[PDB]
Design a protein around this nucleic acid. Structure first.
Ligand SMILES: [Cl-]
Ligand SMILES: [Cl-]
Ligand SMILES: [Cl-]
Ligand SMILES: [Cl-]
Ligand SMILES: [Mn+2]
Ligand SMILES: [Mn+2]
Ligand SMILES: [Mn+2]
Ligand SMILES: [Mn+2]
Ligand SMILES: [Mn+2]
Ligand SMILES: [Mn+2]
Ligand SMILES: [Mn+2]
Ligand SMILES: [Mn+2]
Ligand SMILES: [Mn+2]
Ligand SMILES: [Mn+2]
Ligand SMILES: [Mn+2]
Ligand SMILES: [Mn+2]
Ligand SMILES: [Mn+2]
Ligand SMILES: [Mn+2]
Lengths: 99, 95, 80, 108, 99, 88, 109, 95
DNA sequence: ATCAATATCCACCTGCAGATACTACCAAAAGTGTATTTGGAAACTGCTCCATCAAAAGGCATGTTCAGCTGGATTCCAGCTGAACATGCCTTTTGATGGAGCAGTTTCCAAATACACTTTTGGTAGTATCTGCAGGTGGATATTGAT
DNA sequence: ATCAATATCCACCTGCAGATACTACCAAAAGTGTATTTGGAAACTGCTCCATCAAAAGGCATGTTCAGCTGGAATCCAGCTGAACATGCCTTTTGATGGAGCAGTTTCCAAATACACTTTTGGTAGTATCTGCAGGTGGATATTGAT
């Protein structure tokens, strides 16, 4: 029998690893492509300082991470350990984002 | 001699324009007066910020327009912008 | 393949991990992308409005910082 | 003579808003068009709400607009509700809303 | 055999009744004493215009009603119809009112 | 008779079970656990202290002894709870 | 008299003269009194010291000499008062506090 | 030419006082500068409000004090008020 | 309990991105001297309205009994989501060249400010008189729940 | 479905708090006129740094297989919590009175603005040396999970 870690173990390993670091977690380019695309709908042929795109990524991830923490609490309130869309939904509604 | 001005008479004029036979209780009028003041404050403060951000010492109809775009959502913004542009354009058409 | 889909399942999984999430449902990835998209549209729209007002064709860090501040999401380390 | 509101085709007081802009410490200078534009947006917004409120007052068979009508119109209008999401209207109550799961059924 | 509405029926009648009105739901004098007591512990010899106390009551009730709407979403999310302390706490935490 | 001014204590219990039930109803709540009442009183108390503390700070800054509706309205606003209907 | 800057007079490291100029040009009020910038500069320096003081220790508990964004994040979110003051703030490259819900840990929950 | 000021050098000095042998990275300095700018802006704006609410045209150390009491949490407020009062008094007993 | 398979940690090592120390230069920031203006603290007090007392009464709080049905516990299992791999697409980097356009600079005028007069107006105070609707009644219709 | 106990609806009505209506007074507001100052738009442009390439190097996303263990359905039942009821209190309401204290009005100087002039300093730039620590290697040992 080869060596397999049990479901959840590596996950917990990952929680510990990413809560310990500060690195950006989304790939730069894919992210920068998204930004420009969205911006493109409000104004055409826009240029971006490299730092502007960096602020947006820093704010976006802090935002998502923070949202995942609230969503996790909603999953646990339902006595689950798996976050679901309805958990994200409830968190945004209580925050006044969906309300 | 005590003088506390409000927007009540103007809100009343506008009300008679949209609902010629509808009145308004003084509490409701009080709510509306708070609404108009709130809007004034939010827009002026944003315009004020717009001016500082661009090292300008003058608050023009342009800062105001941008403030309105930043503060009001979708449809409301568009109409407010027309109504404002119109009023200014007509205002300047006079000596 | 297109851009919002550029934000991958594993990147989203990493963000969730940082958020202390142990188990992720399959439908989460598309919900997240939708959420990120609304967040960026809201922030960028305001940044661009600040760009246009300054008569520029370049979105600056300060435009973004100012955009974040009015959305109630103040950001430190990029100016102002 | 002829006031600036009239000159601008507005009900809202251009002169007063201009003064209020100066007295408020928003900038060293306040251009002549600033108060015209702001007065126009203020009036437009008050007109929108009063238009809606007046209709709600009509639906409830009242000829007088009260707080409740303002609250109703504001919370049912997706945009007016976002613009005033952090505002509380005294004596406005809330929107009737009962989660579906709380209703009875299945006989007994 | 006397007439008895079933458990929940009167409750639904009350939800419809209070959602239709706009009057204050907390007794006036008792609320005014609560305000005076809390203010008194901050500064002694304070007086209140009667409208200051009414403003506080309108703000307090709008605040509690709104919190009860969120609390109610947390209960329903747990598949209950009964709101509990942990529902209020969940809502206040996501709301940022807490830690 | 000015003496032994009434002493204010335990007034948070003035917010009764029936009053909390009513607010919850306006909030759309159908069923209420027995421990909700004390939790609510606690929550209301924190809310009020924060608002009254700020209102009183505005009052004191103006060198007054009387808390005005504006003081409260100004207090609510800096807490993100703008209130319409009492001035300003 | 050989000039001793307003900061030196107040016994502050922060620029009382700069802060004074910033108050005026910030459209805060028609007039700005002499004490205001002094008091303000002192409050700012103080908070800057409270945070730098904490962040410094955090850098030494990590066996580092140089304070980095992570250090500021950890000292700010672990301090009840500083965390409330900055509850609406995001610290670039700050990351988050290690924290795992007990129910997610090994063997049931 | 091209000039852009910040509180960096002053922050650095304050750092050396409390921690003589500790350095600070540029990104962290940037965060501290934003921090200090943010404190300035929050206190200044609130001081602005208190003066306006009271019909004062002057922002004096008294407005700063109240603004600090309204903006900073308990203990930080107690201390910041000390630091404040202390610096105004030291500054006064001078020339 | 035994032990293999991995992850994780500590001690040490070293190149280099990034922090640091020194010099040179200058606009502008900041302090000083003096002459003029003025915000707002004092002192006095008119007048609003806040605190407080009084008395009556019924709307609503409180305590209690009773049992319906909700929450919480338990059990069961289908199938979703984690772990581990094998591929290999595509981000990442870094090197370096156009050139868009941010940002600094010189002009110059429409529009702002300051200032003096004059005319209009929105707010109020004193008095009086309507009118929309709250609160009540009474009877008709609807909803709920027991059979 | 039928029958009954109650809640809910609505038309009709009456009192009255709030709304509305003239008369009048004037202090601050608002508009007009000239004169004087200037903010920043417009045009030109130098150089900072953003967009695009090239182009390997391989880190990391994607598809696949497998099954552990989680989510959620189905059951059972103690007892919590809702509905109803009796009792009676304390909030609400109505009207009054003293007087604390908020706010208007005038006086007056300590402190701020307005300026001219001298001195100091924080920031940009060059050129150059130093160093905390990221990232890498060993080897030890803690953790996890199968027996
Ligand atoms: Cl879901
Ligand atoms: Cl203008
Ligand atoms: Cl609970
Ligand atoms: Cl001062
Ligand atoms: Mn007490
Ligand atoms: Mn004066
Ligand atoms: Mn039973
Ligand atoms: Mn159940
Ligand atoms: Mn060009
Ligand atoms: Mn008139
Ligand atoms: Mn009625
Ligand atoms: Mn110029
Ligand atoms: Mn299976
Ligand atoms: Mn389970
Ligand atoms: Mn009793
Ligand atoms: Mn007195
Ligand atoms: Mn120097
Ligand atoms: Mn290392």
């Amino acid at each position: 029998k080869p060596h397999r870690y049990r479901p959840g173990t590596v996950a917990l390993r990952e929680i510990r690893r990413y809560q310990k670091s500060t690195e950006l977690l989304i790939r730069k380019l894919p992210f920068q492509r998204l930004v420009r695309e969205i911006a493109q709908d409000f104004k055409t042929d826009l240029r971006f300082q490299s730092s502007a795109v960096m602020a947006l990524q820093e704010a976006s991830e802090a935002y998502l991470v923070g949202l995942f923490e609230d969503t996790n609490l909603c999953a646990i309130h339902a006595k689950r350990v798996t976050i679901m869309p309805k958990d994200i939904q409830l968190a945004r509604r209580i925050r006044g984002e969906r309300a | 001699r005590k003088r506390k001005e409000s927007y009540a008479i103007y809100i009343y004029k506008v009300l008679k324009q949209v609902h010629p036979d509808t009145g308004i209780s003084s509490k409701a009028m009080s709510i509306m007066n708070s609404f108009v003041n709130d809007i004034f404050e939010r827009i002026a403060a944003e315009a004020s910020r717009l001016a500082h951000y661009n090292k300008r010492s003058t608050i023009t109809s342009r800062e105001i327009q941008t403030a309105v775009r930043l503060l009001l959502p979708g449809e409301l913004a568009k109409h407010a912008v027309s109504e404002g542009t119109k009023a200014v354009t007509k205002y300047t058409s006079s000596k | 393949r297109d851009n919002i889909q550029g934000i991958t399942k594993p990147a989203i999984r990493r963000l969730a991990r940082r958020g202390g999430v142990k188990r992720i449902s399959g439908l989460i990835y598309e919900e997240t992308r939708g959420v990120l998209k609304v967040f960026l549209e809201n922030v960028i729209r305001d940044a661009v409005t600040y760009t246009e007002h300054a008569k520029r064709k370049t979105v600056t860090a300060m435009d973004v910082v100012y955009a974040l501040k009015r959305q109630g999401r103040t950001l430190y380390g990029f100016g102002g | 003579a002829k006031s600036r509101s009239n000159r601008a085709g507005l009900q809202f007081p251009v002169g007063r808003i201009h003064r209020l802009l100066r007295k408020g410490n928003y900038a060293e200078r306040v251009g002549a068009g600033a108060p015209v534009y702001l007065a126009a947006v203020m009036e437009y917004l008050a007109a929108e709400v009063l238009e809606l409120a007046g209709n709600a007052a009509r639906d409830n068979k009242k000829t007088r607009i009260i707080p409740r009508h303002l609250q109703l119109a504001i919370r049912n209008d997706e945009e007016l509700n976002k613009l005033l999401s952090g505002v509380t209207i005294a004596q406005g109550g809330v929107l009737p809303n009962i989660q579906a799961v709380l209703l009875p059924k299945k006989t007994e």
